[PDB]
C-alpha cells in the first residue's frame, strides 16, 4: 500500500472540494462556480467515454445530466446518468462483443481490469436478469466503488501497489493506453478475452506503452520468450557446506 508511482509520477485525482458539504444545512456543497465546475465535467467526459471526442450535437443530449450535476453535486450520480445514456451504448454496447462491453465497464467505472473468469461470468449473470442497467448499477453500488471513489472524486486509474492479484495490474495497463488512445480501435474484439478465460497473461510492450513517464518502460525483456512454461520443472539447488541440496 505504498505504491511508488501514484502521487509521485502521475497527477493527483480530480473531484469535488469535500464530502462534508452534504452535512451542511444551508448548502449542499462548497459551490464551485462555472469555471471550477466545467473543468471537472471535462474530466468526467474524458473518463467515462475514453477519448471519444463527442461533438456539439452529441453533448446536447447530455444537457439534462449536467444540469442536475450542478445542483446535486454527487459525482457518482453523474457517472450513473452518463452510463445509461444513448452515447454510452452507441459506443461500447452496439458494435462490440459481450466481454468487450464488460471490460470497458471495469475501465470507465473502476479504473482496474477484471481479475477472474468467475468475476466476469457473474456480470453476465446480471445481464440475464435486467439487461445492461443491472451491470452498471451493481458496479456503481458496490463496496469497491464506495471505498475508493465515493461521491467525491472521478473514478481514475489508481496505482495501488497492493493489488489482490498481480494479473489485475496487467489487465489495467492493457485497458488504459497512452493519452493519444481511445477505445474504438479494435473492431469490437475484447483484448483481455483470451487471457481471462485461459488464465495466461498479457504482452509486455502493450503494458509498457501505458506506464507513466519515468518508470523504465520496456527494459528487462530478455531476448528469449516473455511468458512462463507451466510444465517445466527446474532444479534449483542450495549450497550447504558439504554439497548442494535440491529441496524439491
Amino acid at each position: 500500500a505504498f505504491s511508488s508511482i501514484q502521487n509521485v509520477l502521475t497527477d493527483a485525482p480530480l473531484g469535488t472540494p469535500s464530502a462534508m458539504g452534504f452535512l451542511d444545512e444551508r448548502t449542499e456543497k462548497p459551490l464551485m462556480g462555472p469555471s471550477e465546475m466545467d473543468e471537472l465535467v471535462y474530466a468526467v467526459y474524458k473518463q467515462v467515454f475514453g477519448n471519444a471526442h463527442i461533438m456539439e450535437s452529441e453533448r446536447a443530449e447530455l444537457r439534462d445530466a449536467e444540469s442536475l450535476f450542478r445542483y446535486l453535486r454527487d459525482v457518482r450520480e453523474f457517472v450513473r446518468a452518463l452510463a445509461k445514456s444513448n452515447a454510452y451504448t452507441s459506443r461500447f454496447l452496439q458494435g462490440n462483443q459481450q466481454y468487450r462491453f464488460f471490460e470497458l465497464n471495469f475501465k470507465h467505472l473502476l479504473g482496474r481490469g477484471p481479475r477472474s473468469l468467475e468475476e466476469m461470468a457473474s456480470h453476465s449473470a446480471l445481464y440475464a436478469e435486467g439487461g445492461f442497467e443491472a451491470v452498471i448499477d451493481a458496479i456503481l453500488d458496490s463496496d469497491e466503488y464506495a471505498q475508493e471513489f465515493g461521491s467525491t472524486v472521478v473514478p481514475y486509474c489508481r496505482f495501488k501497489g497492493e493489488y489482490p492479484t498481480n494479473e489485475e495490474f496487467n489487465r489495467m495497463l492493457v485497458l488504459k493506453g497512452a493519452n493519444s488512445t481511445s477505445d474504438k480501435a479494435g473492431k469490437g474484439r475484447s483484448k483481455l478475452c483470451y487471457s481471462i478465460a485461459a488464465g495466461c497473461s498479457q504482452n509486455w510492450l502493450s503494458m509498457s506503452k501505458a506506464l507513466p513517464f519515468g518508470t523504465e518502460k520496456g527494459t528487462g525483456f530478455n531476448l528469449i520468450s516473455s511468458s512462463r512454461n507451466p510444465a517445466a520443472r527446474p532444479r534449483i539447488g542450495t549450497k550447504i557446506p558439504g554439497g548442494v541440496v535440491f529441496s524439491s
Partner: peptide, 20 residues
Amino acid sequence: RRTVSFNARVARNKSQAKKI
C-alpha cells in the same frame, strides 16, 4: 478523499423522511 463516514443515496432518503 473519500472520508469513510459518508453515504450517497441514504443522504437522498433522510431529507425526504424527516419531512415525512
